[PDB]
Amino acid sequence: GNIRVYCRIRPALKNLENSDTSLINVNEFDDNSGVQSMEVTKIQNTAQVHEFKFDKIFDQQDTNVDVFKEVGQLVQSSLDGYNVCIFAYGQTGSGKTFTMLNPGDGIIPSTISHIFNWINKLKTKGWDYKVNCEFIEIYNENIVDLLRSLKHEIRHDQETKTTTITNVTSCKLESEEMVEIILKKANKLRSTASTASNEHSSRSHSIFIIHLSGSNAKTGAHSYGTLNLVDLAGSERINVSDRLRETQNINKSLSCLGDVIHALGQPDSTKRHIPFRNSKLTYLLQYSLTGDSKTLMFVNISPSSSHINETLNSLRFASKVNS
Ligand SMILES: Nc1ncnc2c1ncn2[C@@H]1O[C@H](COP(=O)(O)OP(=O)(O)O)[C@@H](O)[C@H]1O
Ligand SMILES: [Mg+2]
């Protein structure tokens, strides 16, 4: 299968943000290069420009609907039996949740809408599809069910190349509206909101799993594909001088994730040593990563000079992958 990396620059914050000490420049997509380039410069030293290439770059103009236009084609693949992974990577505040979960806008919401659209359309070709979904968070390497109102163990099935988690609430999606309630919950909890709880969310990975089961009599065919939409824990480098535990956790979690992606993109990713088991995340997702699977990595960045440094890390992490 294939791997891709997008960069998304969010618009600046009305008051507490500026770019007087830094400069981000994005160039127009090219063929000869078949990439899109960007440029990052720190004022303190204008002779050192950091270049970064990607599959695609979204700036402050591209809205959420603007982004899905590029993502819809990837998602559709599940109707064909492929598994898909989508990760939002970046520092707290870069806009990861916004991109994933923004009401009606988000990758998740849009993704759902999009499949139904197709499902409803495939009925004519003799296809009947069923959709189920799970919603958990990985926090300190422990699995947590975000759909409950309990020990969870990962079951991998090699006959099927499918995975399951014990004791995890699963939900039937017969319509967009069905999830749409949860999706509210979800976003608010992760908001700047007074009562919300981002301190925790910031420190954790939230995973939205979706499974499409399709069968067709007039062909007698079957299709099964899983989509994993990841709202990664904040990537901010912490000085480090519980919270320490929480810290180390993340680092290995992200690093591992980066090791794994990079390896999958290598020309000899077959019998290459891939740290799947190194983290709960990659362990959980190995089937949605290996083989024919499609992975999209989204790198979220802030445009203000105030984060120029994390911004650099973020692009380095991204860069490492794509290579
Ligand atoms: N593309 C975007 N356009 C408009 N506002 C955005 C965008 N990305 C993020 N924001 C705003 O930026 C703030 C931080 O976004 P958020 O998703 O919570 O960050 P993160 O999840 O990376 O910690 C929010 O108030 C959000 O509304
Ligand atoms: Mg968030």
Side-chain angles (χ1 to χ4, degrees), residues 1-13 15 17-19 21-27 29-31 33-160 162-183 186-188 190-191 193-217 219-244 246-251 253-269 273-319:
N2 233 271
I3 300 75
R4 271 82 154 107
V5 189
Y6 289 164
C7 179
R8 185 221 214 299
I9 313 175
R10 69 149 170 82
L13 269 35
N15 272 113
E17 291 203 62
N18 75 293
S19 304
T21 304
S22 42
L23 171 90
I24 308 177
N25 213 71
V26 180
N27 313 135
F29 185 108
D30 230 86
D31 260 69
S33 34
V35 173
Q36 198 179 358
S37 324
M38 233 187 124
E39 281 154 349
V40 192
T41 307
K42 301 209 286 154
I43 210 91
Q44 290 266 73
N45 184 17
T46 55
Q48 193 163 78
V49 196
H50 316 88
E51 177 154 41
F52 296 114
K53 292 217 193 52
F54 302 94
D55 291 290
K56 191 123 217 311
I57 302 182
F58 301 98
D59 67 32
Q60 307 98 304
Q61 300 290 13
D62 301 319
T63 53
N64 274 357
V65 168
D66 292 329
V67 169
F68 200 80
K69 308 228 228 194
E70 234 65 40
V71 167
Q73 205 228 219
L74 169 67
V75 305
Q76 301 180 168
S77 73
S78 262
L79 302 153
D80 307 324
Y82 298 76
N83 301 301
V84 171
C85 277
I86 300 191
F87 295 101
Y89 179 89
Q91 87 175 279
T92 308
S94 48
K96 320 180 285 317
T97 292
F98 180 94
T99 294
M100 294 305 299
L101 285 165
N102 189 51
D105 260 335
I107 295 261
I108 290 175
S110 291
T111 278
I112 303 287
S113 257
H114 192 73
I115 305 131
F116 279 109
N117 186 256
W118 268 105
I119 274 164
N120 286 319
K121 167 201 196 239
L122 292 158
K123 291 206 90 119
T124 74
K125 306 251 100 248
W127 281 101
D128 179 54
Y129 272 90
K130 305 291 179 193
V131 184
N132 64 129
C133 77
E134 297 84 40
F135 190 19
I136 78 202
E137 85 163 10
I138 310 227
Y139 178 65
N140 269 296
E141 310 299 276
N142 304 150
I143 289 169
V144 180
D145 196 354
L146 299 170
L147 301 189
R148 60 139 254 130
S149 206
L150 291 196
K151 238 93 239 173
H152 316 288
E153 299 172 61
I154 305 199
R155 301 275 181 256
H156 284 316
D157 185 309
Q158 342 86 258
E159 179 109 81
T160 325
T162 51
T163 301
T164 207
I165 308 176
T166 71
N167 303 303
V168 159
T169 304
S170 190
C171 290
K172 300 180 108 178
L173 287 198
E174 316 217 303
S175 32
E176 325 158 35
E177 336 156 77
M178 270 198 94
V179 159
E180 74 118 302
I181 151 201
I182 337 162
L183 292 193
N187 185 88
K188 180 66 125 174
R190 301 169 223 277
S191 97
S194 249
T195 54
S197 244
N198 202 232
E199 264 231 274
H200 180 70
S201 329
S202 271
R203 320 276 92 222
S204 58
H205 305 339
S206 299
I207 312 124
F208 199 95
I209 321 238
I210 301 175
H211 331 260
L212 305 86
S213 351
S215 35
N216 180 342
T219 43
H222 313 264
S223 250
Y224 196 80
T226 302
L227 294 148
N228 320 89
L229 321 169
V230 192
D231 185 9
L232 299 179
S235 60
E236 52 281 17
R237 179 89 315 136
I238 187 231
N239 47 299
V240 175
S241 64
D242 32 346
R243 224 247 210 100
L244 179 59
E246 157 177 62
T247 283
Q248 332 133 49
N249 259 342
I250 292 168
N251 301 317
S253 172
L254 299 163
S255 114
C256 178
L257 178 51
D259 292 329
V260 176
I261 314 296
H262 180 98
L264 287 167
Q266 253 19 252
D268 173 65
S269 296
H273 302 286
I274 324 227
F276 282 122
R277 316 185 57 103
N278 274 277
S279 58
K280 224 108 224 195
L281 187 86
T282 57
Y283 184 49
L284 208 224
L285 310 165
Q286 60 174 157
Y287 295 139
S288 267
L289 301 165
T290 51
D292 256 327
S293 324
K294 300 155 179 293
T295 301
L296 202 206
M297 166 104 258
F298 250 99
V299 163
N300 298 78
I301 63 182
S302 168
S304 304
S305 314
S306 358
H307 316 115
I308 192 64
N309 286 309
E310 267 325 326
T311 291
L312 288 145
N313 293 334
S314 285
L315 309 157
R316 286 174 188 119
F317 167 94
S319 281

